[model samples]
Target: AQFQCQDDVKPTSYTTEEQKLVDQFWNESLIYLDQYLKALETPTGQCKDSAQATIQTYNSETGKMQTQCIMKYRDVELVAKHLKAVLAEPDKAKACFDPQKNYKAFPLYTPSAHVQNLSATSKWINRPLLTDYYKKIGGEIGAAGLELNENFLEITSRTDTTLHWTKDVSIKGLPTLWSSVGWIPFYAENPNAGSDRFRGGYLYAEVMGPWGNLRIKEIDGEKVGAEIGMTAQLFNTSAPYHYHHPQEIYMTLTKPQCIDQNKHMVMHWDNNQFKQKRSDNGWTVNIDGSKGKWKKWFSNQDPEQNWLTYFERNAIHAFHTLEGCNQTIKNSGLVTVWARTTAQDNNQTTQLCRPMTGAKDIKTMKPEDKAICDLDDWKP
Candidate 1:
């Protein structure tokens, strides 16, 4: 099987030790990642088209690749170096890396712009606003901004975003203008922008790499009024898009639940009550509870059960509407049933839960647990 690799290339000075390390690392990473993947319970998909890109910056004196384990998500070529660094030191494993640590940073991607230039790499010199850089790339904001009260995020497809990378390098002066940067999209409804909506905006990506995060916060006296000038990084092709397509797009608003919140993550109904039952009919979501009852939770009639089921079964990639859920989950916030789903290949069928949110916490609860009460319980 190893010899059948059709990749037309030869390893230069590739030693048995390096091969062992790669295999070990790959196997270990998969073991930890499998837990999450198994929860999705979907068949093996595009991640199979795997490829390895190597970059060896050898030491001038020793003629050895300047390798280390301290990995950076943005720097792709040095990944092996970082991995080797970690493997070389078991004690340092927990120090800088850990076997138990699932490297969510893997499956490297490219950036929207090349930062080989000194000026582009310096954050102090080029603190480019993401908005301007995105604008320069023919990217445009959408009316969803108006639908939002707080500075919420919205997806748009008014520009070419087929790129892979993170960290925007912009000029840092008066109006420290924007420049091309590296980023990824998450929770995109119509991520393949142009094809989804004539006026595309539902296609938003997370704009991320392992190096850092993108945060939205107060800009001026009014958080909603002043816009923070920043660049939105996009890749050159759908390669990365196809690679990291999540199971579902989730968003969570920390602010008080408002009408806007309803539009995103919160679904409310006037006739609210805790209802539970068992139904084999495909139209209903048979919720599973600790008491052994397959209950159901739906709002204002079923939530296009077919769509939800399809995502639960077959997802290439997905994100949550709750932007804060990731943080909240890490912090162990108020917990409840959680699941992820996806719509890929543009074939809206076969909802897969294993490879998607299955790894996340999808709880089994009693009917009373998910009760919808009066205004007291309704604090949106």
Candidate 2:
């Protein structure tokens, strides 16, 4: 019963239909038991001394199979405290410089407009960069981490970060836990695969909620392979300074293989659990033309896509720094970024799809790319 063979499913000893019934029962129970055990026994939060602050495994200690693993945590908090300490001023009175470079540094107790937008309640805001954005206020950011690129923006401490992996292990007397989807199980299908009509999203986190198991089938790899074109998971929560769980993807595709930005190659990550769409941490998709060629290239893993994806469009339309966008291209006014390969893809990928052409600074950038400062002295 460790592994399933066609014979085991065939009508010889147990009818294929019977096998399916048994399989369904097995999978359902495993899912139920797994959730139950995780809720009842699994510990939460990590420690400075532990590699993994969270942990979950497939099958109950009494089950017949061991086939899954899960973990979660807040990423920003993992590093934020350290960074805050590093940037703290002599008295930790106020930062010497702005962290985001959006505002001036101020004493921790002082209140400012931007401080309200930033999640900082820490008493130490004297650090040059840390207090600059918060202005006069201070506290932990609740979330913190570098945005490596547009494709990923990690949030370390959004109340919960993750550091867990799924593994197949050997345990005694464990019943077999079946999965219709894991790496190869079908997630979604786009009958209209013409660079469009490939739109789908799933509430992966929804199922894991307490009491959710009361309804729904025990869906796994194979069942997934039969339906849907993609699976955007938001559950597996681990990896420091990493947005989106390690193997669980933010977004993905099934056929004609979208060009991976990082070394364009087919993606096949072993661990595929991740964060589901939450109020703060979630995935966004654009359907049809609204998706814009930008997102297509982002999902494609193409070299040239970067040119079209990040810089080219902005260049022609003029540079923009609205919102939280902070970019610096080598070429003047031209916004051509490197199409680095992703961690998943096997093939080496590169591109210069969107080329940049604008001012080096916000003032020099195209009007569209530039923004007028609230202060007249800083205005372009």
Candidate 3:
């Protein structure tokens, strides 16, 4: 439905072509607005009533009062300007409409002041490192630094590592969105585990808007997809607690053969493994891959099961442990992250692959942690 404006207040020089473009922009942007509203009604989306804000503006064209509702967690004006920019410049708008190509353009997050940036002198021996890159992901780091003993990438945190893509991703329904093509071992039940006892790190490859945080994980030897409320504390939220309120969602693919911490596994948002598709409903995630022996679950059919949906945002982190607690990553191999709008195009370039620099502790690193931060150890 279009908002009607008084005939006398209309733009004098507007063209038919211009009107068409403006209408298209308005229609498409409405979808995002609608999705945002629905998400706000979700369990995790419930915000404090005080966060509800309103703006009163005079519409020149309609000569009427316009009231706008604003949510604390949402930046409506930002999304509006972004869409307006896309329509104004058609030639340069392709990237803005595509998530894979535009995600790198988002602002990079900085680590909190409490984070550490140590350098390793014994491991690579004059080689570059990927220490500073960890800072961008967020939270404090272990005093020992990110270790690269052969393949493993060890992480030790005293507080927590809250690494995430600075902004939300627009792309959805891609084949396989993976952080690393290897297994993520959580430090569960270790004697040296943190006092909080949630020492293991988690990988959040996909984040839906406010519905909840979706992660593909294997706990105690069983592979399954999990839905966690965004309200939970990010630290030790993965396994140790699984959040105060959590939901178990199954993937279309067969569950991994008993979670093997020693084995290298592939963790990703798989759209191809099962011909999954987004439903006409706002955010129902459905996968039609099940035979006589396999079971199928679709969120659209079950409201309780509706928590599981395809992620439209991206985030991956190796959360740190509490002070005096340590975590380790070993024999870590290639981290291949792939995404494509359609099947015809090739895979998108890797955003954060290996070797990053720039940190407070890096200045004191001998041979320089900065030197190793940009090293291209693993290339696709």
Candidate 4:
């Protein structure tokens, strides 16, 4: 009977209560699907792509719904994904819809010593500067063709070195209120250095999440070269690094849970110089007074390239770089950035928030480019 929806989610032989829940799920699915399709019709292409698919939607695509759009439209995949999540048993579906219980249990990786005991709360590292950080270092920061509010920050950039728009606040501990959690919303600009290509950027977080121990990495370009390996690619992976797969860069988590279910694991060249924690050697958090190790993704594989040490050194940070074509921000395409800062206990988490900063060669920033990077409203 056409299933009365997009897929095989119609309740065929379940109880009245079971069927009722299934109907609700099906209805919710239809709304998102319609919304997803409507977004696809827009000119700005503000519609999200498929990387944001929920595991359920991602897992269900082999049968119904079109998988052909997998790499093209994320909003479509998300609708499908949500539909699948809602069709499960009532209890299971309820949990799936709850933001707090959504994080599938994934253990944090342990890091080596050099990468150990690192804390975004530490005062040893210099507090980042608000402006001129990227200007002095190279990269664009601006307000034109961008949007902002207390909860959201959006930016558009043309050209790149390390393009970013962020506030000077460090977040270090899990929030007492789950709703207080912050997240970085990302979208890939004209991917793959193709004619449709605008530019590319890397998305990740430091000491940011409900648990305050999440670190996500997904670089879309080819392996970065040695001289300007992962370190330089910190903000943007272009030029020396080009996109091998465009869709990977724009992937986003379904919610701000402890860990993103879809993981983007990339192995870099310098992965063995950081320090390791010997069960009791890393950053430990305390509420009021008691302490415990913050659950985080760590790596003992190689000290120099350990995830903990690398991310700890750079917290509350984001960046973008030009790709394929070695062009300046003035000559490149438009890029956008979106982020949310969660409220934290200032006494403890304040130390973790670093000042907004940037870095790049200054000689390349022409006057036109300079105006974009130096926008007053760009600061948080």
Best by TM-score: 1
Candidate 1 local lDDT, 1-380, one digit each (tens): 00111121222232575444333433333232222222122222222222111111222244432222111222211222322333344332222211211124522111222221222222322323323333343433332211110111211112111111011111221011111122222212333222211111121212111121111121121111100112221111111111112222221112212211111111111112212232342121212212422112211101111111111111122212222232232111110111222211233221322211232222211121222111111111
> If both were scored by TM-score, which would come out higher, candidate 1 or candidate 3?
1
The weakest ten consecutive residues by lDDT in model 2 span: 144-153
Error of 2 at 151 (Å): 25
Where model 2 places Cα greater than 4 Å from the true spot, the runs are 1-25, 28-197, 200-380
Model 3 weakest 10-residue run by lDDT: 293-302
Judge candidate 3 at residue 306 and give its lDDT: 16
The regions of model 1 sitting more than 4 angstroms off are 1-128, 134-251, 256-260, 263-311, 315-380
Model 2 C-alpha lDDT per residue in residues 67-160, reported as the tens digit of each score: 1212222221222222223223212211111111122221111112232223221112222232233222222111110011111111101111
Cα lDDT of model 3 by residue, 1-380, tens digit: 11112112212333576444333333333333233333323233223431121111122244332222322223233333332333354333221121111122222111211111121111111212223443332333221112221112221111111121111212121111111111122232232222222222322222211111111122223222212111111221212111101111211111111221111111122222222234342122222222421111111111121111221111111111221111232222111121111111122222221112333332122211111111111111
The C-alpha RMSD of each candidate to the native structure, in angstroms, is 21.8, 26.1, 23.4, 22.1
lDDT of 3 at 12: 30
lDDT, each prediction = 0.21, 0.18, 0.21, 0.20
Find the candidate with the highest lDDT and give its number.
Answer: 3
Model 4 per-residue lDDT tens digits across residues 3-81: 1121212223545754454344333333332332332222221224422111111112242211122324442333333
Candidates, ranked, TM-score: 1, 4, 3, 2
Cα displacement (angstroms), candidate 4, residue 79, comes to 6.6
Weakest ten-residue segment in model 1 by summed lDDT: 299-308
